[PDB]
Design an enzyme around this catalytic site. Structure first.
Site, mmCIF file in Angstrom:
data_model
loop_
_atom_site.group_PDB
_atom_site.id
_atom_site.type_symbol
_atom_site.label_atom_id
_atom_site.label_comp_id
_atom_site.label_asym_id
_atom_site.label_seq_id
_atom_site.Cartn_x
_atom_site.Cartn_y
_atom_site.Cartn_z
ATOM 1 N N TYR A 19 0.780 -1.263 0.000
ATOM 2 C CA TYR A 19 0.000 0.000 0.000
ATOM 3 C C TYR A 19 0.800 1.295 0.000
ATOM 4 O O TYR A 19 0.261 2.344 -0.314
ATOM 5 C CB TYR A 19 -0.967 0.018 1.195
ATOM 6 C CG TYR A 19 -2.087 -0.979 1.069
ATOM 7 C CD1 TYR A 19 -1.896 -2.332 1.413
ATOM 8 C CD2 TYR A 19 -3.336 -0.576 0.610
ATOM 9 C CE1 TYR A 19 -2.910 -3.250 1.287
ATOM 10 C CE2 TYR A 19 -4.365 -1.485 0.468
ATOM 11 C CZ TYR A 19 -4.153 -2.819 0.815
ATOM 12 O OH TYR A 19 -5.187 -3.706 0.682
ATOM 13 N N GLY A 27 -0.835 2.289 -5.785
ATOM 14 C CA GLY A 27 -1.954 1.358 -5.589
ATOM 15 C C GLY A 27 -2.283 0.887 -4.167
ATOM 16 O O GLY A 27 -1.891 1.476 -3.150
ATOM 17 N N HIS A 50 -4.105 5.551 5.048
ATOM 18 C CA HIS A 50 -3.936 6.772 4.311
ATOM 19 C C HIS A 50 -4.641 6.750 2.931
ATOM 20 O O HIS A 50 -5.311 7.757 2.556
ATOM 21 C CB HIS A 50 -2.449 7.157 4.209
ATOM 22 C CG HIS A 50 -2.225 8.519 3.628
ATOM 23 N ND1 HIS A 50 -1.909 8.704 2.298
ATOM 24 C CD2 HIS A 50 -2.251 9.754 4.187
ATOM 25 C CE1 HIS A 50 -1.768 9.994 2.055
ATOM 26 N NE2 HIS A 50 -1.951 10.655 3.189
ATOM 27 N N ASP A 84 -3.011 13.357 6.224
ATOM 28 C CA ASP A 84 -1.545 13.436 6.052
ATOM 29 C C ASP A 84 -0.819 13.440 7.410
ATOM 30 O O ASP A 84 0.195 12.740 7.568
ATOM 31 C CB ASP A 84 -1.169 14.652 5.253
ATOM 32 C CG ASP A 84 -1.439 14.511 3.757
ATOM 33 O OD1 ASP A 84 -1.996 13.467 3.309
ATOM 34 O OD2 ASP A 84 -1.068 15.463 3.021
#
Lengths: 118, 118
Positions: free
Chosen positions: A28, A32, A48, A93
């Site tokens: 991850y 992708g 995320h 983030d």
């Protein structure tokens, strides 16, 4: 935006690995993602990705939006309140930047065979 | 001395892990050492231990001697020439500092059961 996410990561880890080390890790960490996350760090990236997908479905453009943040001696944090799309993206983030900084980095999981393993 | 070795390590790794991360790793990174070195990083420490043992047998006091060095943008290097004991000690530390910086750090090998594994 991604420029800002790189600043948060480096704030959170005190400059201890380059941001690019998180751009092709596990299933991850990188563009992708599917399969079982390979370790704690890979699970950070999965969260995320789900956070960015949610933001795009909200009309927030997580890769395009410049948000307000500060990098303290505490590490980074978000500064938007009234601009809600900016805040949502920045929260994705910040959470990931702290997650990355806390997770162990397993070199065996950098640049894996994603087809064979994901 | 050890204060200086810590400066070299941090010079060589650009401040990417604290020096104390190299003080209880594998069978050799740390005070003692015997057994098979557990990985490339542990082999660096084994070489360094052999280098310090040689220096003590030469009458060079590797843990007591303050040597001359510089930390460049190239990483660190030794500056003694005429003071040969100083140079020998500094060379042990510089080689190890570059070795540490190049070796992968395997978290599974931090603070192991040395009695069971060494």
């Amino acid at each position: 935006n991604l420029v800002q996410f790189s600043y948060l990561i480096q704030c959170a880890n005190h400059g201890k690995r380059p941001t690019w080390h998180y751009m092709d890790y596990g299933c991850y960490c990188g563009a992708g993602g599917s399969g079982t996350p390979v370790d704690e760090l890979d699970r950070c990236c999965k969260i995320h990705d789900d956070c960015y997908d949610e933001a795009g479905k909200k009309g927030c453009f997580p890769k395009m939006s410049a948000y307000d943040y500060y990098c303290g001696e505490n590490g980074p944090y978000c500064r938007n309140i009234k601009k809600k799309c900016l805040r949502f993206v920045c929260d994705c983030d910040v959470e990931a930047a702290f997650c990355f900084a806390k997770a162990p980095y397993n070199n065996a999981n950098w640049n894996i065979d994603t087809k064979k393993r994901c």
